[PDB]
Design an enzyme around this catalytic site. Structure first.
Site, PDB file in Angstrom:
ATOM      1  N   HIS A  10      36.144   4.996   5.622  1.00 46.28           N
ATOM      2  CA  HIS A  10      34.866   5.588   5.190  1.00 46.28           C
ATOM      3  C   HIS A  10      34.159   6.424   6.254  1.00 46.28           C
ATOM      4  CE1 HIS A  10      35.355   3.320   1.508  1.00 46.28           C
ATOM      5  NE2 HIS A  10      35.321   2.156   2.138  1.00 46.28           N
ATOM      6  N   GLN A  41      40.606   6.596  -5.696  1.00 43.51           N
ATOM      7  CA  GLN A  41      39.368   7.259  -5.295  1.00 43.51           C
ATOM      8  C   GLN A  41      38.894   6.699  -3.947  1.00 43.51           C
ATOM      9  OE1 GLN A  41      37.513   7.185  -9.964  1.00 43.51           O
ATOM     10  NE2 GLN A  41      36.193   6.992  -8.162  1.00 43.51           N
ATOM     11  N   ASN A  42      38.202   7.520  -3.143  1.00 40.45           N
ATOM     12  CA  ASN A  42      37.704   7.074  -1.835  1.00 40.45           C
ATOM     13  C   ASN A  42      36.590   8.006  -1.355  1.00 40.45           C
ATOM     14  OD1 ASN A  42      38.179   5.175   0.606  1.00 40.45           O
ATOM     15  ND2 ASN A  42      38.185   7.229   1.543  1.00 40.45           N
ATOM     16  N   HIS A  88      32.258  -3.489   3.937  1.00 42.39           N
ATOM     17  CA  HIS A  88      32.611  -2.882   2.638  1.00 42.39           C
ATOM     18  C   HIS A  88      31.560  -1.818   2.273  1.00 42.39           C
ATOM     19  CE1 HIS A  88      32.875  -3.104  -2.005  1.00 42.39           C
ATOM     20  NE2 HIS A  88      34.133  -2.947  -1.626  1.00 42.39           N
TER      21      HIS A  88
END
Length: 135
Positions: A16, A41-42, A130
């Site tokens: 991320h 997806q990211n 997360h």
């Protein structure tokens, strides 16, 4: 899925924060080679790891993805981001998986925990683990 050489914080940074190319097809090769599957997806946040650690210091809130968890924190401000979406699968040759890219400016909500005692650096006692939601 997390490969065994990473702590949760290290895996968060890899998925991320550290977008190794501004192009989704190239950047996603890293995540996909590590986890042995093309992620559908990211989201990459265009912010620093230190900035996300500071978000872990904002008030606690319920995680949108799990009603039972209270370890989530809202960003306070918006950031630029890039969302990657799989357009072209290739489960027998992960290298030839292609993505679209979508730029946006949004808030985010992260889950944070105490660091991995043995493996995370003592510099950061509390770390992001997360990406719960973009809003």
């Amino acid at each position: 899925m997390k490969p065994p050489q990473f702590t949760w914080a290290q895996w968060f940074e890899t998925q991320h924060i550290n977008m190794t190319s501004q192009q989704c097809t190239n950047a996603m090769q890293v995540i996909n080679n590590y986890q042995r599957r093309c992620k559908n997806q990211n989201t990459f946040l265009l912010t620093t790891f230190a900035n996300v650690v500071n978000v872990c210091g904002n008030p606690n809130m319920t995680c949108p993805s799990n009603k039972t968890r209270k370890n989530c924190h809202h960003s306070g401000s918006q950031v630029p981001l890039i969302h990657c979406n799989l357009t072209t699968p290739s489960p027998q040759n992960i290298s030839n998986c292609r993505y679209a890219q979508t730029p946006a400016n949004m808030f985010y909500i992260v889950a944070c925990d105490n660091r991995d005692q043995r493996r995370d650096p003592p510099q950061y006692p509390v770390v992001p683990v997360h990406l719960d939601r973009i809003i």
